[PDB]
A paper describes a structure:
There were Dnf1–Lem3 in the E1 (apo), E1P-ADP (AlF4−-ADP), and E2P (BeF3−) states; and Dnf2–Lem3 in the E1 (apo), E1-ATP (AMPPCP), E1P-ADP (ADP-AlF4−), E2P-transition (AlF4−), and E2P (BeF3−) states. By comparing the 3D maps of Dnf1–Lem3 and Dnf2–Lem3 in the E1, E1P-ADP, and E2P states, which were the three states observed for both flippases, we found that the structures were superimposable in all three states. In the E1 state, the A domain moves toward the membrane bilayer and becomes separated from the N domain. Due to the lack of interaction, the A and N domains are flexible and are visible in the 3D maps only at a low display threshold. However, there is a unique helix-turn-helix motif (E692-S737) in the N domain of Dnf1 and Dnf2 that is absent in Drs2 and ATP8A1. In the E1 state, the helix-turn-helix interacts with the P domain, specifically, its Lys-702 and Arg-703 interacting with the P domain Glu-994, Asn-998, and Asn-1008. Finally, the Dnf1 and Dnf2 switch back to the E1 state by auto-dephosphorylation. During this switch, the A and N domains become flexible again, and the TMH1-2 tilt back to narrow and close the exoplasmic substrate-binding site and open the cytosolic substrate-binding site. It is during this last transition that PL1 in the exoplasmic site is forced to flip and enter the cytosolic substrate site, replacing the resident PL2 there and leading to the release of PL2 from the flippases.
Numbering used by the authors:
A (entry chain A): 205 to 267, 539 to 857, 863 to 884, 887 to 1439
B (entry chain B): 50 to 414
The structure:
Amino acid sequence: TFLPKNILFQFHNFANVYFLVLIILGAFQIFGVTNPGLSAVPLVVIVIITAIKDAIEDSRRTVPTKKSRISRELNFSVVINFVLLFILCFVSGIANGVYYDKKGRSRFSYEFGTIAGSAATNGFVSFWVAVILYQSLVPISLYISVEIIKTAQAAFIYGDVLLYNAKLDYPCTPKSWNISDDLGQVEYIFSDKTGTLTQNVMEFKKCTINGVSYGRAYTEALAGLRKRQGIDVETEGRREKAEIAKDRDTMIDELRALSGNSQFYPEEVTFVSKEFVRDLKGASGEVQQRCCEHFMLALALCHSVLVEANPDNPKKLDLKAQSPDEAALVATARDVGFSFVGKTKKGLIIEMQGIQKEFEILNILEFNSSRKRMSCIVKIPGEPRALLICKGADSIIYSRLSRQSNSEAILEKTALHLEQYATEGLRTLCIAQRELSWSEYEKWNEKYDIAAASLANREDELEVVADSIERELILLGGTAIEDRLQDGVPDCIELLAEAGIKLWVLTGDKVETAINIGFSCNLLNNEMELLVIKTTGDDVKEFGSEPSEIVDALLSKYLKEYFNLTGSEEEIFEAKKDHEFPKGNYAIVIDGDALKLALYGEDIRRKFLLLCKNCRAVLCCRVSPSQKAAVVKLVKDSLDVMTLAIGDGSNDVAMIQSADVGIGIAGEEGRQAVMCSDYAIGQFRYLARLVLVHGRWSYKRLAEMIPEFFYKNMIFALALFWYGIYNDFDGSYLYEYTYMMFYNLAFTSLPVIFLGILDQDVNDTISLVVPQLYRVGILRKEWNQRKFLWYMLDGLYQSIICFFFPYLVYHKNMIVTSNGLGLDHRYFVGVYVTTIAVISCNTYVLLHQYRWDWFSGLFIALSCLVVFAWTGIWSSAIASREFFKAAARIYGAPSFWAVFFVAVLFCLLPRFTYDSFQKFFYPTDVEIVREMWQHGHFDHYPPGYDPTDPNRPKVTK
Amino acid sequence: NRRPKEDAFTQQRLAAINPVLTPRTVLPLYLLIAVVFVIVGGCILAQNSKVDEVTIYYQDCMTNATSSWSDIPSEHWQFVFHKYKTYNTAPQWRFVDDESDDFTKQRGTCQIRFTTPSDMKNNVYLNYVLEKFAANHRRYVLSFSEDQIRGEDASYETVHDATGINCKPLSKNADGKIYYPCGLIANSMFNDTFPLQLTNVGDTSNNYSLTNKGINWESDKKRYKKTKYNYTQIAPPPYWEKMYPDGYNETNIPDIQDWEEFQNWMRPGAFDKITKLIRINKNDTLPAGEYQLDIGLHWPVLEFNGKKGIYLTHGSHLGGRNPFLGIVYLIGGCICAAMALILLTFWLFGGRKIADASSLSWNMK
Ligand SMILES: *[C@@H]1O[C@H](CO)[C@@H](O[C@@H]2O[C@H](CO)[C@@H](O[C@H]3O[C@H](CO)[C@@H](O)[C@H](O)[C@@H]3O)[C@H](O)[C@H]2NC(C)=O)[C@H](O)[C@H]1NC(C)=O
Ligand SMILES: *[C@@H]1O[C@H](CO)[C@@H](O[C@@H]2O[C@H](CO)[C@@H](O)[C@H](O)[C@H]2NC(C)=O)[C@H](O)[C@H]1NC(C)=O
Ligand SMILES: *[C@@H]1O[C@H](CO)[C@@H](O[C@@H]2O[C@H](CO)[C@@H](O)[C@H](O)[C@H]2NC(C)=O)[C@H](O)[C@H]1NC(C)=O
Ligand SMILES: *[C@@H]1O[C@H](CO)[C@@H](O)[C@H](O)[C@H]1NC(C)=O
Ligand SMILES: *[C@@H]1O[C@H](CO)[C@@H](O)[C@H](O)[C@H]1NC(C)=O
Ligand SMILES: [Mg+2]
């Protein structure tokens, strides 16, 4: 399962088959110029390394695949490299043929050679010997280097400690170890709300019992409403939360003074009504008391929660429910003093006010996604009767009312309370009872039994019996649950918005409460326009008659008014090129039907995409999973851009898979969004630290690392081409074979690999303090093809220098030694050239590193020293044939060191001078920030500084 | 649990320096390198000017030289004496034909007289100089046998069917004997006979003596060894058949360990100009005077318009006389100085503030 598949997948490239052709040409069709038994070492070692590493890859995958944009640019780079190698070999062959044309030379005399008529044959042999000569110009270690670098970057992303969430015991486990650098170019983020931005634990906040609306709270949607209006939300909330904390303390005190509860726990109490805790005793009398107790009893009975002992203490219960809202209701009913324990063969057990009492549940018409309600008939002993209690939606209940048994005095005020809760941003419920005397209950029970006795899709008869029986109800009131944001979500959102990332939030909540929660999350802020595409009656009757054209009119107006362009293919093509952060501070808000009708047709899709190209913030309300996937793919496919999609659950999985980067929010249970993702973080907050720090880092690291490589190898390779000019392109090597293999195996590999692994322009603290540094990665400036072409031109020039400086030290009289003895063998000029080239390349890498850390410095020094030591060790062994004492004869010549130092100076002077001219008179943002860092502007921030952590100390400015 | 190990390496918080290059830091380095490189370049150039050389190309002897002494044409010699920048005193040469030798292509003796007006220290090197002899071609350079060089009695298969380094075109003769020094390299050796002394024309009682013991690295005697062949399995290369007209008998087999002109030849010059030491003198200075060198023409070069010559020097520590190192050190130091001056000019004219947040690409617009 390893050897066949791995060796085939490895040889499926062009570089690998090229080197295999080279091995076969050196061994099977040997012309006579090769050391074949050892020329097969680079191929076999890279094959073994890739085989081991891919074995580890598949092992990690066991216990679809994506590719970054850098990889496709890398394919194009390798294509240009091969074009250059072919041009070199073409010129070699042509010139060797034109040479063998000549009719009087040293060869006819001393080489036993003849005039091979139609010299094109020797030209062809020379082409195929130069193909093997210019080995090192084939990028063969490039792919294994990029793979090592990406694996190391993903291991750093994993083993980062500021991403491990201690509550979940879940570090940021990467599921794709080759998109780290794609993390550094994110330009759009698509984020589900309910599970991602808000901790998906619903807490019961308020309730309107018998027209009395108990409950006081400061919700994030209320805070957002206050912020949008203009009130100082900071002081408003400080006062409100202090008041409510004092009220909660006194509420728990009064609750303890009321009665002794065995299942009371103040830590998970969320009902904050001092009015309720005071009115339960005597404040309104007996009728409101009875209403409240009946509300609590019905809330604590009508449910499907299964309770089990707490692993810490067996007396505490865990309240294991299926839906969060039912769990919240039963938990608050327990904490108020109506606890529910156990589940016997008949009914259930409630501890009310401290005493046990059992019930008899007969028929639980369970909750269904299509019924939108959960009902239950309990037997009340005393002459027992039937109590049909049903919990559902407000409209669901208001559709099923009785023509007489409605107060219509409590109903109006309860509806007002429900509307106020919906405005404040809470999920509302409705609860309705029905009292059934003994005779009518006997009749209805026999009818229900004979109706359920009908099989063959009993659901139809069941729903018709439900329609017949639940038409008359007596509503008691409503509840309200709250979904709080996760810790640090507003800070993370403002960080990602300063970084230049456009943010999309895909909600399931109503438009106005979504806008309020956005203002609370800082997705939208003040001095930011809200372009709404609501298809409400006020815009319908003013624009058109039917939808799907009101939205088109609205898109056209919001384009033509707040910019000067209209939806067109040329405007799409133009905006495809720009990535600048938009100015003007606009935002879009769109409903589910409007999004559907904007995704329907092609021109409307074009207009919607051009409008959302600007408008750094976009809110979509009441969307579907299909719509999530559709908007992600519309933003990605057209307008080719890098997209991240973060979510949880089972619809955000379809949202995640159709995106460049997919981030899953891990719950206490492993979910599909986690599994079918690319990365998996504990909380949305961590997305800031990931995307900025690592994103940017990886992106820069790869960027600067790739041209480096394409330059380093070039130097060496091209030097051989230059020796071609002086040996008439005949195919003799200027380098020893161990030199030609180790220049890529050991001499110049670790410097560029460590540049790609460990480099940091600014540390993580500055990365998170000045997030705008991300904008360059958004704009795609650190990695183009022009950068690679400039690095290759520099490599060509440095190869010219590294060859023609030793050649020029020889050219006068071929005596370069102090004792007049000879060093004129071509392996010795090759030692000259190789040492100059290696030291130039490693010092280039060092000068282009941003951070000179001791690991990188040690290994650059070791690469240079290993060049010197390999020369010294291979010479001193007699097994080197014509290379016997290259070390003791070259490193002991002052000519060698003179050329060495001046040639390294001449190789590094143009690039260093240009870098100085840049850092002086056209500095970039990271250079300005590094100067501000040297002057000490970032000294007060601690080393590990996450500005998105609530339990963190603030700084001066 | 699964908490990642807090560690200075895995958290990427290694000890490091972050070198930002401000003019106050770079310009001093530019000036320092400029100063040291200008000083070293001037020192190298001044120490190099003191190097005197004599080059004489005698390939045109068999046709231009006569039986009586005559001036050498100005194209064939190059004198460089630093005390006397205007010293021509053209050398002379005379050809002594040898009708006994039947190799009409190159035979006789070239006698050259040259007048050195200054001494030559105490370590004098007399190299020969081949021009346009292509000793760097693909098949040539690989045509020898490291099994014979090391002294083995390698059979025909070890000598012929070895790997890349093998004497293929000259592996065997017609009679069935392996060429002892095989291959195009050892076969095409340089053949002129150089004298063991420089005859003094004025005072013939003090002749300047030369040697051929010490013209090659001593370490090379660990790689070359005396053969173990049997004088019946070996025969001279096709071109050594004037030096061994009867073949190898029990006495004439060439011991390549103590034969350093061979060892110098088996090191194929990388480029088109070949300069190999052939004579040395490590004891006596070469006093000013008129000296005579008698070379026995054996090696043909006019077939391919090549050149052969003598090159007599004392040398230097950087080898012969070559102004490239000093010139390029001076150019490097002066380019560093020029660039430092240009950067300082543009700084004192249009120099921004260093740590100014107001210059950042977003705080600007
Ligand atoms: C010194 O080295 C000379 C350089 O090789 C060498 O010249 C070579 O001499 C051989 C004969 O000794 C010639 O061989 C052929 O000569 C003619 C012309 O083809 C043929 O009739 C012969 O049968 C034989 O095949 C080489 O051609 C010749 N090499 C060159 C380049 O001309 C001298 O012989 C050497 N002399 C001494 C004294 O060592
Ligand atoms: C210096 O070298 C010259 C080279 O010729 C020597 O002169 C030769 O000496 C020998 C004696 O054995 C004579 O047979 C030659 O005729 C001389 N040649 C010439 C051209 O004069 C001279 O002997 C050497 N000096 C010393 C002190 O030995
Ligand atoms: C320089 O002096 C040294 C030592 O006197 C010479 O080396 C010796 O030379 C003789 C022949 O002249 C040899 O027999 C010895 O084996 C050499 N010994 C060593 C240790 O080298 C050397 O030849 C002199 N150089 C010149 C040019 O005359
Ligand atoms: C020397 O060679 C040159 C170049 O061919 C020629 O013009 C000149 O006449 C020659 N001198 C003698 C003396 O042969
Ligand atoms: C060995 O060969 C050489 C070749 O020049 C010859 O001069 C010498 O006399 C030979 N020795 C014997 C013992 O035959
Ligand atoms: Mg969700």
